[model samples]
Target chain A: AYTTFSQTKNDQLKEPMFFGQPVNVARYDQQKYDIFEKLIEKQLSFFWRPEEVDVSRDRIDYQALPEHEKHIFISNLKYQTLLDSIQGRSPNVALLPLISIPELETWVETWAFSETIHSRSYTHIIRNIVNDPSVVFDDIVTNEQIQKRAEGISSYYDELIEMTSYWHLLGEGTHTVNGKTVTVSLRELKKKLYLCLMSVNALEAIRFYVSFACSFAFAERELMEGNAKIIRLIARDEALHLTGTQHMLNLLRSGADDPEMAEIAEECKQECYDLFVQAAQQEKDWADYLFRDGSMIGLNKDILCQYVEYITNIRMQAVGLDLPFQTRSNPIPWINTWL
Target chain B: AYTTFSQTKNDQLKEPMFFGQPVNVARYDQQKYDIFEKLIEKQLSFFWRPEEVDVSRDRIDYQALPEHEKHIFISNLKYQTLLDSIQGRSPNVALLPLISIPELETWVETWAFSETIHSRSYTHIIRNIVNDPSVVFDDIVTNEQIQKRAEGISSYYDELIEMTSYWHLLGEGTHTVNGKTVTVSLRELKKKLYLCLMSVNALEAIRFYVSFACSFAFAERELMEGNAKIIRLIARDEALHLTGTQHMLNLLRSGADDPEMAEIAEECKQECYDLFVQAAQQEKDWADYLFRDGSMIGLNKDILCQYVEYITNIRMQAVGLDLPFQTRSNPIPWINTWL
Candidate 1:
């Protein structure tokens, strides 16, 4: 079922976006849904290289910052690196094996590929700002705050991937492995995937933007503008990815793509709401960690926490989840200038 | 063994390129092997959109061709699309789950991304060449001659993926599923991966070049020059991919990356030889199918078959395999110009 080439020639236009068949021919002359194709086009049109940006002035800007502000800036970059690194590998490793349409398959690869560019940019920015790039790059794996952030983001994808492996290896049935019982159900796997998409939507709409407030706060003061410019480019691409995944989730929930998915979406509504709120709570905790030393000019824990809540309510509504937080206007509207 | 993010921080510099802990942090300031990073850089440098290339004039050149030559031209374009479509997904879907180092992990994605560009190039060419482009694209799935090309190529990847799924889901052991016993072995998975790399090497070195003979033959007569420009662009990227996989295979077989892989490579040397030869013979059969109506001016079934043998011997030697075919000089010297 998961052969790289299916050999049978079926009409690609009739297939669901996921779990139909492994796309055999990568044809794009037509599509089952053109939204995926249009996003791929926009992503390619937004093609960029991290090395193309000049972060030369950031070295001096970084040197002049106080020890507390330096902690704020350096810690944020380390978190940025982990998130992109997680994203660069997870979508392809977790999702590509089950993708059933040509446009969505290619879109997943193109989306993951874009995140790698962001990873390279972290290296580029860190290299220019510090004498030992390893100090920053290596700490991404060792930091406690960074390590905590990885769990909620990767857990849904990890569960989905492990469930997919069992389903592919043993099919949907009860089995005994090493004298332990294992049950893999298709409906259960479907719920795993639906929540996995919810986690990804939070990653794009909530988590990625939370990191952006720290980056743009520096630019608001005309400091670290090179880092600011590069982040603006990163945010632009995330905007499209946010839209793409949201649309994909909406189609599944509305039963436009698959009826089983719609049934599962209703079944798992409470769990999806909890994961999204859990994601928002983690961002608030991270804001406390970033500003533990002292408050900066344009951003602090209180300000950024409010921003996270503000943005979280909007994204929750877009995915058909109930609003999980008290609503408010954007905390720091001037941060939009860099965005 | 497979999570979206591996939380235990380890020295990535010391990890084997594959089959260690999964890569957690994606960084590029340093690499365990610099070749993958260098290739990633080179591929980004060679990036060109297929739509950016003007395939506008191909329709005129295509309209003037006779029925037999038209068959040769259209069929090659269709075959070219399938090969790239297979490549576009197989490497990312199959290889990414097992890669352990950052450079190699990123390199595999960058390599597959380039193939999608080649896939897109065909759609661009086919759209410009015919009024009913679906007629050509649809036949790629329905044609019996085209379907044969998919098996030998995708079989190795298919087996490796299935075996890897079992290894990840149940670990290396025997288990009972329903009434049947299933065995999963790490050694068998390693052998599957080694031969899979060998099959990919033949694809880049021998099979891709055999199709190139037909493509350049048209350009040699100064027709279909727009189609020719796009193909040349594709082969240039393939040259880099060719070098990437061969180096990957060489490193595995030489024990520079892992000693066990070297042992597995020696054990399966004969099967690798047979598969490569099996692939070459299939191209000979395809050459027969392409020219079944009649032979064109500068190209025929016999000439293309000779080129396949010539290229196969050279690529076999590149990976420490004995030359299986009779050695001969280049059959068509003029093909080098486009290359």
Candidate 2:
């Protein structure tokens, strides 16, 4: 069901974004979706290395912070590392095998590659600030608050990945596995792929912005400016990643008239709304833990949560998902400077 | 069988390269394999964008070329594009899910991303030379001489990807599916992975070097020099890619002392020789087609074939595969200037 290069030749511009045939030749002279091609070019032009930004001054500022501010900074960093750790591999591992267009395929590869840079930036920041970086890195896996957020995000990708295995092998059929009857169908898999994409959209669009707000909040002060410099580059790349997923999600809706994707938008609209809100809800949950020691000067739980709903509503409306939160102005308008 | 982020707490330094717990964190503070970390940094430092190179002069040089020379130049670009098209997506798609170490996982993602840049550079080159780039890009899929080469390179990756499906879904067992006996084991899949890596090593090391000879031969005459600039950057990155695979293969030799990898090197030694030689064999096949038009200065059927046997011998010896060709000095020592 999956081959690295599909042997059967077909017009690449006419292929569906997924499940038509695997992309045979990687050509980008033209594309069915020019936005993905533009996204790839934009991302390449934004190519960067984490080591380019020095975090030396950050060590002093990090150490001098009050204990609660330190807690806020470190917790945000841990949560960030967790998100990128999943992001670095998930798009390629979960999405590449299913892609049917070269433009989208390469875009996914570049998007994941950028996330790996963000992951490396965290290690650079942590190594400079702490004596044993392991003391901070080791806790990321077992931290209950972080893991709670990790579970919801990872579940969508994990489910898509596991079902993808079934769809590829024993493809689209009723089968007996471990003496239990199981059903797999192409329509169901397409729906799964659609929702998985929405899940990714919510994370990239919703969760990552909340994470950015906290990082930029620290930048609002003169403290931790070096780390802020690195994250600002990360935020710029993230802007493209969310743009990519948003385009992918919206195209499926407009393509619904094409029969293959017809049922997807109508059938999954409710699930998509809930998925985006759950992401917003989880960020609020994490915000409480981030402020548990005490609130920082520029950010606290309530205001950060308000920013979550504000950003979430805007993101949902962009992709035609029903908004789930009340209308409000941005709570952290100062965050735009770092953006 | 696979989770996007593994939840279990464990020491990353002690994990095997594959089939250990899936990597739970993306950290570069330390790595079980520092060679991969070094490779990632080297690749990052080598980052490039195709548009950075001026190809306007290439349009003039390409048009002024003799008809036979045009055949030689355009065919090499198509072959190179086909190789990169697969290289761009295959590593992340086939290898990322199986990786256990963070350093290698990120290395695969970065390697594939660099290949996409190579893919885009071909577009940049072709678009500059031809009004309708599709005239050249369209033939890449249906050309018999080209498709023959694509088939072998794609088969290894395709087999590994499919078998990976069975392993992930069914877990180690002999099962009946579609009324056939299927034995899925970690051991057999590891062998498939070893051969796939060897297959990749041969393409990156042997096939690509031969292809580069054709590109550089034209550059030897100061024609298409803009295309050469891009190829030189690509060649530098290809050196790191082949090095990474050679290291991975060699480690499997020493890792044979560990039980999980003990049987792999012993089992695949003969197949490894055949795979590398077959890649060498196929390049000679391509040489006949590449020179079916009249020969160009500094490169032709006899000289290019001699160089194939010559380069193939050196690459095979690096990973301890038995050399299939007799010893010979590099017939085209001029390539060193390009490298």
Candidate 3:
């Protein structure tokens, strides 16, 4: 049932963001929501390559750091690499089949493509500083602390993909596969998509920001300036990615595109709240790992946790979710300079 | 089961281009295939924005053309738009999950993202030339000649995705879906991927270059120079995209990456040849449709048909297939100046 070009003759302006007739002709002269077109323009305007930034000085900077600081820096980088690895491919695999509008469809592809640049930059940074880069890359899978967070971030995407396959193949009906009766419901699939977007929101809004704070914190001490420069570029692109998910969530909940999705969003409210809280908790746990050896000069577990809460509230509020943490001011005002 | 991050600590350099282990880390320090990495670097270096091109002059030139000339120009542009619309989304949607190497994964995403740029450029050209661009965009879906070709190009991708969903969800086995027994074979799925890559290569090598000839022909007469400039930039990026797919097909047939894929390529040689010949025939038929009203100055149905036959033999030879048509010299040598 899935097709690259759906033959149904329909009005794109009237179609919902997803699960409408698959976009036949890609056109941007008009859009159901102009924000997506605007986002694609802004992202293309932000085109960059990692090789453009020279990180040679970062290798010298890294060798002078204490063992504890080295552990913190490298571990934080491995975690950031892990985040981009999943994000680099998941959005396209999970979301492309469901996208219905041309503008939003293009935006999703552009946004995911930018993350590949982010992933490439990390290799640039790691190869400059470390002798055996494979050691760090290999540990990302077996490291318990990193694996704990990978589970949370990928679970929502994995479920959505699994359910979507059945929905597309068998459609919404009860069927037997290998002697087990399986029921595929469109409403349930819609609910899964709603929660999956919420999970993605938390990853972009809270998870990535926390890692950015750590990356910038090293630069706060005049260390790894080149790495910080590349991260800053990544952060600039990420702000648009954050906005993309936020707009999708807000649009879905407002019943502007799909009324059924709005109801699904409302029903998944508690699940959404818990999803954010769990991600925040995982970030806190990750903080404990990054600083387990010793805290850095400008950042530590306490301050990072506070920053996570501060940013989570802002992101959740943007999508009309109640704040799950106590409202507080920015823990690191200086990070804004880098952002 | 599919995973965003595979837990197995396999060596990426030993992994095949597809269906090895899903890439756990996005690192470019090393690659099993350096060609993909080189292609990525070159594509990034050739980054461009469609709005950067001044297509404003094309609108006036378009208005000055006779009815027959305008018919040739508009119909050719509509066909180019249709091709980009499918290419923009299909590679990422169909290929991302099955990719097992990091460089190839990033290469696929980069390739798709550039097509979106091509897609945006079409809108720029269309909106500038015609008053109601909807007329041009809407006709792409209803037009018989354009829809006929879209079906052939999209079929390989649609089948690959449908079979891949079942493979990922149910694994390789016979199972009942919708109360009917279906066999899911890994070997069959691999064959689908091989042919799909061939279809994509022909698309880049033959289809897009055909459209490029028509656009450049107008500029050969010193008209539509602005539109010609934008298409020149698109063609440069497409040179890289064409190299990517050709490399994939060659690698699979060489038995250097995956022996099983090499065997599949050997088994499907005739099918691949027929696919390219069929696509070439469709382009000839499309040329007949474009010039039905009248021919332009530098390009006509016979010359364009000769160009299709000439280009098809070159593309077919690239993937180790025997030439299907008599080789001819370039029909429009002046188009080389613009390309």
Candidate 4:
């Protein structure tokens, strides 16, 4: 019933997701996309501000750390700076206009809004732990490890956004632009959308979980509890984001929305598998880099690598993917206990 | 520079208007879009939940009204419902994706979020005063007079959004889709955007002002002071909205953000004038309909029409358009005291 909240003319809003019909009214009273409503409620209950966290002690704690520990903390800070830098803006820019459902549209914005708060928390962390914060933020876009992942994450979103825009502008057709025959087909766009959502799922699932482990690793040894507090809230937000993706993936694969998307899901199954596995590999490499100099008492590169595979399997299985790696138990199970 | 808050690099924020670049860092110490900063401060200062308003007197007052008087009240309420309903979602949908600056993006979201609260206020007010609020909300889309304006208002947003998706996705391209020759050009998109902003300005500057007159007329007769208080809060928010559009129009007209937009603005000047004048005409007709049977003590169709012309000329002149009607003082200056 709801397409753009204005042009609604029927009572068929009870239909399945995606291409069933565009949303007619922006009514929260009734919802077929009830996960989004839960996400919204979860987001509101988790409302927080970076300013509410006290980072004052971190300034002194940061200075007291050894040079290598300082590097570990700041570099991890830089990586998070880059990750949130992409996340805070990309979802709304890439997802909002293309969404055919109101609950999904609102959920995307709510998710992005929470990410902006995460972005703000990075600045809060940096401003406290570093004397010249610009040096840290400046390095994020330029650093090799961070920039590589930035390009990977942003490229997928950019491709999906560009293709979706083309689909909307020039519907399903073959046409010439700049002396090249460009095909704008719904199937192609849906494939790109499927991959993009898969890419984002990997991001919310693997990359962010890896970062959360690092934040908690610091807190486990009683080093940076304030930063850990903020990361906990961010992790709560990511749970909703992960659920959002799980819903989109399941909705597409089950043919609950667009039947063609179901076919595309089957078509792109291996590629989707590769996305999660590849992101897990990236996080494992990131773990190696994090513990290159020395491992903390509670965490090491080996354990973090094990944690990555364990979470990867859980996340993939949640979205109906078979586990690829065999990391049955978390090496740092105490971390889960702490959480 | 601000573009999208995520994709932007963490340097190059300067003091300026709201749409230069997507703000990468959400630092309050620096502001490139100070108008948004001011609006944020103003909005924070003006915050009030609808529940705090003592509308207990309004139920009794509404029941005592004559049949035509009820029409005057409920129809105005219905129109308010439509305006706030659209305002609640449109800015986030239409404006947020395209905004390149941070403060402006936040302002747009904050503005839209505030309107959602305003929409909630309408439901609260209508439910308390009317037996079945759904009947009034139902008629909002079905009523011919309100529907015509709703169609007029939303058409520009829908087109702008579609083309913005096109511009962002395909860049500039010529393609055939569904046997239709589709050319997606940045200039065409800019023109659509300029006209949309102008249409939004007309809504805020004239259509909303007309509604304010009707709401204030009740308070002039000491009938619905509580409802008038809520309307005044909405009025305060509308002032910020009007200023937002004025800034956008001026920015486009001056070639500050995109140089091509200035040429588009010049080309669309006549059309913009027509939109403003047409809105004024609609308000005049609506005023006559409002006072068809009898006049409120402080408001009549004749004075309302003159006020429409007076406010229209003032608003048009502010945006670099000459008055089509002879300049005259407000026909009812006493309402100015309420503002």
Candidate 5:
């Protein structure tokens, strides 16, 4: 609810949703949303630097990998780079202004901060794995598969942004803009937010898992184990992130945070379902793309698609979505060993 | 220029200020402001866990402290606990929605995330120093001196929340709310934002420096070196935070972010001055209170007052303020040893 920074006055903070009450006091004793404090504590406890883990040995392991294996490894790294680059800045940009509660506001920041760390780890891993890290980074934009995923994620955020501007600048009205009638409503904005959150949930829950399977596949054969170690750490943090999203979705659906949001979530249920299924299908497509050249040890297109279904069910259950796919056992059980 | 949550579509993000575009895409590659990206880099580079620092030696250091020394040590820690408890969540809560630029938005989150680390560090220090950390943490809200600071800081945020709610919910109208004329003007809200940012800058730039001197004074005498080490790291991060506000002010003053913000900054300049000076005075008062029992080796009440004036002048000048204090050399030159 606040814009300019000020010293915190905490007493009034107990009333706002995410951005309603100005968070004047910086106190933890009283909490409008205790979940954020818990998330902060959990994130702090889980904090680790990339330097603490040794990836020096992996430099040699990467040098010995064949060209196609190298493409499989480097391409997965590039995808991770793209995923985290978006994540590193998106939540803070999209959610900060909309956040009314202090804890949630801080959680958004903390969550984004964690993504920055993930971004740095990729650079660290990339620097160690390849002689020229820029080559892989440069390819992200030119690559068709990664570019498609980027557009899908960015569209919802763009729509939310445009809708927010209309509501903020002109309010709801049948206004002619460039000789066209435009109408904006509170319910419409809330629906945008619901769908936006759903998009984000799919990105975190399903898209990242697909990448994780690729990371673990290399470690399955006892190669690039150092890179796997970093991925394990990233996955552990991702678990907390997905948990935070689940809580947000559940809170909205239960009519706890904002009642209007509860109604919006119900209305947008089908859209959310589409979002998850789209992402799941895309991940399956990405798997086919990943193994197009040849299959890695213990992992191929079929198994990766199965893993996507398994995880989709897990993710669906988290946000009260009916499971779209049968709960299949994990395709690569030994991948759990890496985690 | 925005409601509590903006809902609009103009596709003119190129013309918006930081936090202005309603954040179309949460992409990090292209940032309107580079300062936030730099802050994110610095924050990531500074990534660490309290566990990695090995506070086992600090346990022995705490056991050897005298009664008054232990009192000085623990009380300082408690004050920090109060400071960081508020800091851990307030920025994201207060500033996220107003931020239009992607970089500034990310900076707000990144800034708050580091504070969470500082908050955790205190608990680690307290755990090493005493048997029960909870006993000390519980008293932060109820303490008179600390609570006063809390109230002061939180008030601006609360006012901001109220105004934002009115603007968002009522949509800039002369609404009849119990026969009251409520006018929501863009200038008025921008003024509030300007004042709040100044207040936050004062908190991070002035109040934090005053606290740092106390921690360093202990290290000057070669006592509590471990605590000082942690504080040094905290100070390094604070340097980046202070720089962030300075850049924000410069951008606003330069009239590039928003022409309206430039006008607001000019209008609120006097108020900003008063707030900054008042914060400086409060730090001096706190200095008097901290040394009420006795002065430490290198720092005393008078010296701290001098330090407050010294740091305040530098901070004020950095924000384009005319310095108020006569220049004085740093009273405790030897404190740089720990840094």
Candidate 6:
């Protein structure tokens, strides 16, 4: 069902985005969609090593912060660390097998690889700001606040990956495995892929932006400017990543690639919208947890919650989903300065 | 059997390279194999955008080429493109699911990302040199010469990927999948992984060098220097990629990380040797096909064949495999200047 290089001689531009056939030749002179090729070029142009940014002042800045401020900052970093930790590998693991176009396939790898750089940036910040980086890294799984968030984000990828294995191995049909009848359908698998991309778009669009506000809030005070500098670079790349998924969703819905996927996108619209709302709600809950100790100087739970609702609505609309929250302007206008 | 984020609390440094648990966190503050971490840093440090190198002059140089020279040049570029097309996506598709350590996981992604850049560089070069890049790009799949070579390279990755899917779905046991009794063994999977890495190592080590000679030979005549510049960068990156696989094979054999993998490496030594020989033989056959029309200035079928044997011996020795060819000095010493 899966071959590293499919032997089929077909026009790449005529192939759908997914489930057409596994791409055999990696040729960039032509593409089914040029956006992915453009994104790959843009991402390569945006490449920067994490070590180039100095976080030396971050440790001193951290020492000056009060305990609650420290809680907000470190927890936000851990959450970001978890998000990228999943993002760094999940796209390649979950999406690469299902991709049938060369440009999209390489774009997925390029996107996942940049996330690894972001993951590396976190280690650079953590190693400089904290004496024991292990405690912070180790707690990403054990910390209840972070663990719950990880569960939501990883579950989408996990289900998609598992279902993909079944689709590839046993293929589309009812199969008996260990005396249990499992039915795998191309539509169901396509639905899983659509919803998974929606969840991913939410993470890249909503979850990452919420965490960015916190990081930028500290930078707005002129503390942790180095960390903010790194985050700014991350934000730039993340904008492209979100753009990638947005295009994938819109393209699937437009039926330019796969007619069946357009049907799946419509059939799963409510589910996709709910996925975004759920992510937004979870982020708001995270805001509560972040400020449970106390609020920082310029950022608080209420303001962060407003920002979540505001950004989620904009992101949902970009993908043609019904706005899940009351539309509003940017709550933290100063965050734009850092972004 | 596979989870995106494994919840188990295990020391990552103590885990085996593969088949322990899927890597849950990507932290580079510490690593069991620091070589991989170093390679990641080196790759990041070596990042270059393909557009920065102007291939415009190469188009003029290419247009002036005699028919046989054009045949030698374009065919070499096509083969290189074919190799990168597979190398770009195959690593992430096949290896990401099995990796356990964070450093190695990130390294694999980084290596694959660099290959994508190489893939893009070909487009840049092809679009500049040829009026219709489609004819050249299309021939990659339809061309029997390239397709034969692609099968030899892709089969290892394809087999490992299929076995990996089975291992992740069913774990290590016998199962009735679709009413067919299938036995999944960790030992057999490990052998597949080892042999795949060996074949990949041969690719980066032997096959790429042979193509580079053809590219550099053109440069030696002061022709297609722009294309040569990009290939030089690609060669620098290839050195790191080959070093990565070489280190993985050597580490597995040393039993420092996984005792079971060590046993499998010992058991698969003969097969690994045969794989390298087969690849070397295939490259020689490709050389015959490349020179079937006519020989270029500095590189020809006999020289390329000797160079293949020369590299095959050195690369085989690096992984502690028995040298399949008589050890000799490099046949084309000038290729080293470009590499």
**Residue-wise lDDT of candidate 1 within B120-157, one digit each (tens)?**
88988898999998898788778888887787789889
TM-score of 5: 0.70
lDDT of 2 at B15: 84
Candidate 1 matches the true fold with a TM-score of: 0.98
Model 2 has an lDDT value of 0.88
Q: lDDT tens digits, residues B142-237, model 6?
A: 899999889888999999988888988888999887688899998999999999999999999999998999999999999999999999999999
Q: Residue A91 CA error for candidate 5 (Å)?
A: 1.9
Per-candidate TM equals: 0.98, 0.98, 0.98, 0.84, 0.70, 0.98
TM-score of chain A of each: 0.98, 0.97, 0.98, 0.94, 0.93, 0.99
Quality of candidate 6 docking, DockQ: 0.78
Question: Evaluated on chain B only, what are the TM-scores of all the candidate structures, in order?
Answer: 0.98, 0.98, 0.98, 0.93, 0.92, 0.98
lDDT order, best first, reads: 6, 3, 1, 2, 4, 5
Model 2 Cα lDDT, one tens digit per residue, A1-339: 788777787888888888778898888888989899999888888887877888899889998999989989998899889999999999999889888888999999999999999999999999998889897888899998888878888888888888888888778789877565779888888888888889888888888889888888888888888889998999899889989988887888887324667566778898888888888888998898989888978889999999999999999998998789889998888988888
| Model-by-model DockQ, in order | 0.73, 0.74, 0.81, 0.27, 0.13, 0.78
Q: Model 2 segments beyond 4 Å from truth?
A: A256-258, B256-258
Q: Give candidate 5's error at residue A187 in angstroms.
A: 3.1
Residue pairs in steric clash, candidate 1?
Answer: none
Residue-pair clashes, model 6? 0
Candidate 1 regions with alpha-carbon error over 4 angstroms: none
lDDT by residue (B1-339, candidate 5, tens digit) is 332222232332354554354432233444567777788778867876554565667777778877666766776677777777667666665566566655566677778888867866776777776787656765665667777777787677657655665564456656544345668776787777777778878888889888888888887777777788889888888888888888888788778878888877887788888888889998888877787777877888899899899889989988877777898787766655644
Positional deviation of A154 in candidate 2, in angstroms?
Answer: 0.9
| Better candidate number, 1 or 3, judged by lDDT | 3
Candidate number that wins on DockQ, 4 or 5: 4
Deviation (Å) of A191 in candidate 3: 1.2
